[PDB]
Amino acid sequence: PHRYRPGTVALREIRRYQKSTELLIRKLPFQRLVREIAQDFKTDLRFQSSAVMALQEASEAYLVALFEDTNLCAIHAKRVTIMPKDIQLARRIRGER
């Protein structure tokens, strides 16, 4: 049947996910991850639904911003594919490493 060529659905997805603000990570898996990490610092912690949302909003914004910076340095290397070294470079240039 009809098939979209590579990159067509990616551009469409970029437009769709940029035109939309909803959270892209599943709420329940992220909530479990937050709890798993939080238990390392202090056990039996409880998280307000607003607190988990705050972490997800920040995490999605942080990663989206990081992917923007990563995309910029990927284009600089004359690549469209982002590589782990691109994330590592951006994080080092950003000063967070």
């Binding site: 551009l11 914004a61 989206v64």
Partner: protein, 106 residues
Amino acid sequence: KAKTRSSRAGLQFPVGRVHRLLRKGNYAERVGAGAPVYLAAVLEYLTAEILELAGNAARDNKKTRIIPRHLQLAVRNDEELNKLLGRVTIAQGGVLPNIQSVLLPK
């Protein structure tokens, strides 16, 4: 007759609250009477600029209610509010629609 300091200054923002907050925020042991009037005027001005750009974005999007998307679009589109709020993340704001020319088809 008692008339609010906000109306005297020609401002909507609560000069009394701004004065209260400055007195309670321990920014100094004393706060001059002109400080909250000046501060309230700046806060009201920035609020008007933000809402004006947000309302224009809402109208462009044929919406009549400002939602976080419009605030984010306004803040990031204005070359000076973006710089002021460069370290700020707006919940449910998303990002500016932008794809680099190199990524677009030939």
